[PDB]
Paper text:
Enzymatically, nsP1 also has a role in addition of cap0 structures to the 5′ end of the positive-sense viral RNAs. Each nsP1 protomer is built around a methyltransferase fold common to SAM-dependent methyltransferases with additional insertions (membrane binding and oligomerisation (MBO) loops 1 and 2) and extensions (ring aperture membrane binding oligomerisation (RAMBO) domain) that contribute to pore formation, oligomerization, and membrane binding.
As expected, we found that both ligands occupy the active site in a state corresponding to the postmethylation reaction but prior to the m7GMP transfer to the nsP1. However, the definition of the ligand and SAM binding site densities drastically improves, suggesting that the ligands are more stably bound together and that this induces an ordering of the active site. R92 and R275 of the neighboring protomer move in to directly coordinate the alpha phosphate aligned with H37. This contact provides direct evidence that oligomerization is required to complete the GTP substrate binding site, explaining why nsP1 monomers are inactive for GTase activity. However, it is immediately clear that the substrate is not correctly positioned for nucleophilic attack by the catalytic histidine for guanylylation of the enzyme. Surprisingly, attempts to capture the m7GMP covalently bound intermediate by adding 2 mM MgCl2 and incubating for 2 h yielded exactly the same configuration of the nsP1 active site substrates with two new densities attributable to Mg2+ metal ions. In conclusion, the presence of m7GTP and SAH in the active site results in a metastable conformation that cannot transition directly to the covalent transfer of m7GMP to the catalytic H37, possibly constituting a regulated checkpoint of the capping reaction during infection.
Residue numbers in the entry:
A (entry chain X), B (entry chain A), C (entry chain C): 3 to 364, 376 to 452, 458 to 469
The structure:
């Protein structure tokens, strides 16, 4: 019996039960959290990871929040480099909770944990069994398992290699699905988790999930010094989970979209296998095994299975008054996708598609703020399919036109919707051979306060 | 079991229960208060804050109403600078209640409270454990927790820094949502709390919630000495909560719209994290942690999650006979917003939208005095969406026109409505690095009366 | 259990129960009073005031009717200057009732009351504990509470200052709502209380609540010596409550529309807070706290919260044969206002609006004699809204036209209806800084009769 802080009548309960059939999920609502579903998924994921691994194993918790591991019988070594502004609060919460359980919880090594915390406070660079202030690449604690829970600030191959050279043979990554960033979308939603993310350039849009614009009265102006003739995704994105905001980097996010098999070639060499073991409406748990030596061959292909529909479409919005178009991604429940199979046989207008989608949403199966764009997406998709049926080609042929050179062109059709239906797979060519991994943050007053 | 002075059949009861799932909310109506909902929310909020914090903590109550902390087992130090015209009544009520419970309540430190009150009356500058006549920046009582309950007259960063340099590590702010003032609206409503606020310039309007106009026949006159060619929001706004009026300053209101993480850089430096822990139909409880030292990096982005729809729209009204347009904001129940998803797929006239909204309101889900403006808003929003669909742009392009200089302009489209649907987030760029905080009010007759 | 002399089936019972939730209101009809609702409200108001205040307090009763305080256990000092023509009757009734309970009621100080009455009859200037013949500004009895029950003949700031310099710190005012006289209406109704008031100039109208006209054939005559080219509200108004008539002065009526906070600056200075604690369909109880010393700042704004709709509209009537137009105010039940929200989305003729209002009135929710003008009002309001929608302006602009001078006029639109919907607030700028308060009525044989 695992108790999750979500509403009893919530429809995410069924999705969580299907995602974790080996547990008895029961709702025990105690707080009005606006990101309750994400926390519930993380809780169930760490429970599953603990179930899978050997009790005698020692687990590195990279980018840890130590207050969450303090009621765990497992042997966690929490790596806390204090690199984020929210970290001091987490460390203070850990210290307060340890003090509150100092002589009242017996078999959770609370005395050992407070001793290690005081030792790290005394000598910053000491490596205690349960705590340290180092990073993933500077910690010296050898272990058998590594866990990354909502860690997006590390390059995946470098961190994984640095764990592997320390004897780590199993790694676990819990996070948001990295597929929408492999498609290079400008903005997007994980609607089941009340999560909206956007490129920094489109934060002033009007109709995406995460934006804020102003009311204006029109001008042929807004002159600027930046010749922004092109609107393309840049590295910095903003995540909003419920109401908490997190900046992310696209390279770091995409690094965690690892292939099925890859090779880390350093002073030591490792053959690694990445596998998505849990997938619930945009939240995934990935298992990475690492074995010394080079074995087999790598194709460099990462595959995402779509239990629910995944949409990326073009949207026309108004950013700071200026009308632009950019790609927006979302997830659509598989029941909604199945109920639109017959409608998309014909060309449908976005208004008719929206009306049908609202009909299928009756309570609501999917969030309504994403219904318009989805409708638009579907409409475009339907039209494009007709185009393909209308302009049928010949087998074994590919029409090419010369351009007065030893080089030839052809026509690229317009594609305004990528629609991965339920039971399909996205396949992306990514790097699979990594060989270049060669590429003191606590203050005295915080030290005094922790004591 | 927490008892709230609201009607048993009130629909706000379900909203309060959802906002506070950790309590058993029971209606016990004893007075015909016209701002009963706001008082009920404040009561439940202080109960939640008391639940969260350690009993041995000492709590600064900034801008306190000491009569409300008098039946509390917690250790409150009430800071009462007596800068409001409603403060003498509150102090007299506190003294009268203390006298009425001097020898009837045993375990609430009533004797201590009367002793401290008499001590401050004797020597005004004395700093007693439970009472003082200083301000937030002149009080000397060190504490661990600070509470701001309906305090809008202080600059947030300066006050928080002055608490932090006194050892305060946790602060709580209970008050009306600051999002409508981040959008620079001229007038607005919190309809669930019977609250209407307006800029001082539009108090003579006709159809906003808080206004009063006269009956006129129409003249080509009203000549004035002030060249008012622009109608823009000014600093002073008027709040009417039920029937009690409060003047507010826009800058002080907006200062409390703090980012997720920020830095206070003074003689001491603090890394602070602001989090909205309670959000109920326009009334919020925010939790601010403060930790010494500078950690991490700040983006300067403040995020509001919209459980219910938030609307800002253009309204045409008559102020002192003169027809003008200004922005008006409001909150719309999420069920109403969901029920209008299908209708807003096409362009709808404001009259048809109003009739539909009246239909969905049957008892009433939302206040009727806001239905017209909301209807108008929806209509405009629908229209604008279609325009965006009609004038579709190209990906990665941004049309710009030169003006015989090293500058290029473009066309800014129409925005008469900002509609944040349920499960979306507003994101605003605000200051996150604060480093300039360097920027005796009791008379003898009141001293004699208090004794 | 409070018993009210009203009909058991009266619909005012529910309104009174909502206005006084702290009491059990039971109808005990004993007389066919035509102003039974007003008397019932006054009875419940004095009960609530008595409940609120400390039993050991001494209560000034300004402009008292001593027969009503005579079965009161509280310590009332009745101030009876005998300036009204209905006062000798009240004094005789008081003496008769005292005699009738001289040796039959033991614990109501009847012997003391008759002793004080005989003392004042002997020496008119003596200040006895329970009775005096002075005014509010000439009484010398110091007290802690003052009560004004249906007192409209005194300037509010001067009377309140004279009470405050006598140690009075709490004052209560029970009376008809002063909002209709802040809007400067010519005639009006409190229909729940069967009350109609009119300006003296329109007493000869035809279709207002309080008027009487004659039957005429119609002539091009009625010459007069007064160039009455203007019809404006003058000071004198006539109230008819049921069938009892009372002349009132507009200045004295409006003086009691006090701001939320104000300052009395005389030889002593007081900071006063006015708050409306009871509001029932036009009858209000206001609480005024007074504290010595000047504190805070005053805005000068008085706010009225509308639980029911408030209408002021232009009506065309026939006064003494001459067709004129003037403003008429009234209250509309909130259920009627809510049921007309959808209808007022479009332009509706007064006849269709009247038929709809008669339909919603089925027993009757509102008085029928007020339905026509209300209908007309709604119609005009609807039309005006359309105009505001039709003539949409630009944000941040205000069109002004020069007149060959350093002055610029503009166009003032028509306003034929002020409609304060339920859950709105009227805000009026009134005086809040008062500093100029510097601005023997019993005969020998009434004395002999009283003995
Ligand atoms: C550290 N972190 C956490 N999340 C997600 O946001 C949710 C809350 O993230 P949180 O760090 O605010 O949890 P907190 O310590 O405040 O404790 P709680 O409020 O009781 O939950 C988590 O469930 C994650 O799914 C995160 N999401 C992104 N994109 N980036 C991050 O760094 C990140
Ligand atoms: C001090 N203050 C209180 N409020 C809100 O108005 C409501 C009443 O505010 P109040 O100060 O009038 O309460 P009072 O002391 O009269 O006791 P009560 O009548 O029994 O409640 C509160 O619930 C607040 O939500 C306030 N609202 C604004 N905008 N500004 C303020 O300063 C302010
Ligand atoms: C003194 N006075 C009383 N009223 C209202 O008129 C009603 C009756 O006023 P009343 O003075 O005629 O009561 P009376 O002494 O005759 O005893 P009763 O007939 O049993 O009630 C009261 O309920 C008041 O609401 C009053 N109304 C106005 N406008 N002016 C006044 O001076 C005034
Ligand atoms: N290079 C690095 N090596 C190890 N940890 C790092 C790191 N860069 C950032 N981090 C840490 O990663 C953390 C992400 S916040 C993590 C919260 C916690 N893991 C949870 O499950 O809720 C930050 O606290 C930051 O300190
Ligand atoms: N600079 C300042 N420092 C501390 N308090 C201040 C202040 N400026 C104004 N105040 C106080 O803030 C109060 C707001 S009224 C507060 C009422 C009370 N907190 C409640 O919960 O109902 C006023 O009484 C005023 O005295
Ligand atoms: N200046 C003044 N000071 C005190 N009382 C005054 C006054 N001017 C008029 N009054 C008194 O106010 C009274 C209004 S009739 C009041 C009736 C009584 N208060 C009731 O509740 O029914 C008159 O009797 C008149 O004598
Ligand atoms: Mg959150
Ligand atoms: Mg497998
Ligand atoms: Mg109020
Ligand atoms: Mg949080
Ligand atoms: Mg009568
Ligand atoms: Mg109040
Ligand atoms: Zn380590
Ligand atoms: Zn202090
Ligand atoms: Zn007297």
């Amino acid at each position: 019996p695992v108790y999750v802080d979500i509403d009893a009548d919530s429809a995410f309960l069924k999705a969580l039960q299907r995602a974790y059939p080996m547990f008895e999920v029961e709702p025990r609502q105690v707080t009005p959290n606006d990101h309750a579903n994400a926390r519930a998924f993380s809780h169930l994921a760490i429970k599953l990871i603990e179930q899978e691994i050997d009790p005698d194993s020692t687990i590195l918790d990279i980018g840890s929040a130590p207050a969450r591991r303090m009621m765990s019988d497992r042997k966690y070594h929490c790596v806390c480099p204090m690199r984020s502004a929210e970290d001091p609060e987490r460390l203070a919460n850990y210290a307060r909770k340890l003090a509150s359980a100092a002589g009242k919880v017996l078999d959770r090594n609370i005395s050992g944990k407070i001793g290690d915390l005081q030792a790290v406070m005394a000598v910053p660079d000491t490596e205690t069994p349960t705590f340290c202030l180092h990073t993933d690449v500077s910690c010296r604690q050898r272990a058998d398992v590594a866990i990354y829970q909502d860690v997006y600030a590390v390059h995946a191959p470098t961190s994984l290699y640095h764990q592997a050279i320390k004897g780590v043979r199993l790694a676990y990554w819990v996070g948001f699905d990295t597929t929408p960033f492999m498609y290079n979308a400008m903005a997007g939603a994980y609607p089941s988790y009340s999560t909206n993310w956007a490129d920094e350039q489109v934060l002033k849009a009007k109709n995406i999930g995460l934006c804020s614009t102003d009311l204006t009265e029109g001008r042929r102006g807004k002159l600027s010094i930046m010749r922004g003739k092109k609107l393309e995704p840049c590295d910095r994105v903003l995540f909003s989970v419920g109401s908490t905001l997190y900046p992310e980097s696209r390279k770091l996010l995409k690094s965690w979209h690892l292939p099925s098999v890859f090779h880390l070639k350093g002073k030591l060499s490792f053959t690694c296998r990445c596998d998505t073991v849990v997938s619930c409406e945009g939240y995934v748990v990935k298992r990475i095994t690492m074995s010394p030596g080079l074995y087999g061959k790598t194709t460099g292909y990462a595959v995402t299975h779509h239990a629910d529909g995944f949409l990326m479409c073009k949207t026309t919005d108004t950013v700071d008054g200026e009308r632009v178009s950019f790609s927006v991604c979302t997830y659509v429940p598989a029941t909604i996708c199945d109920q639109m199979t017959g409608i998309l046989a014909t060309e449908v207008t976005p208004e008719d598609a929206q009306k049908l989608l609202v009909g299928l949403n009756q309570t609501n199966t999917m969030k309504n703020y994403m219904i318009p764009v989805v409708a638009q997406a579907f409409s475009k998709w339907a039209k494009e399919c007709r185009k393909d049926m209308e302009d049928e080609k010949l087998l074994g042929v590919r029409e090419r036109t010369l351009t007065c050179c030893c080089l030839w062109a052809f026509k690229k059709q317009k594609t305004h919707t990528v629609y991965k239906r339920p039971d399909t797979q996205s396949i992306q060519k990514v790097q699979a051979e990594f060989d270049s991994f060669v590429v003191s943050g606590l203050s005295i007053p915080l030290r005094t306060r922790i004591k």
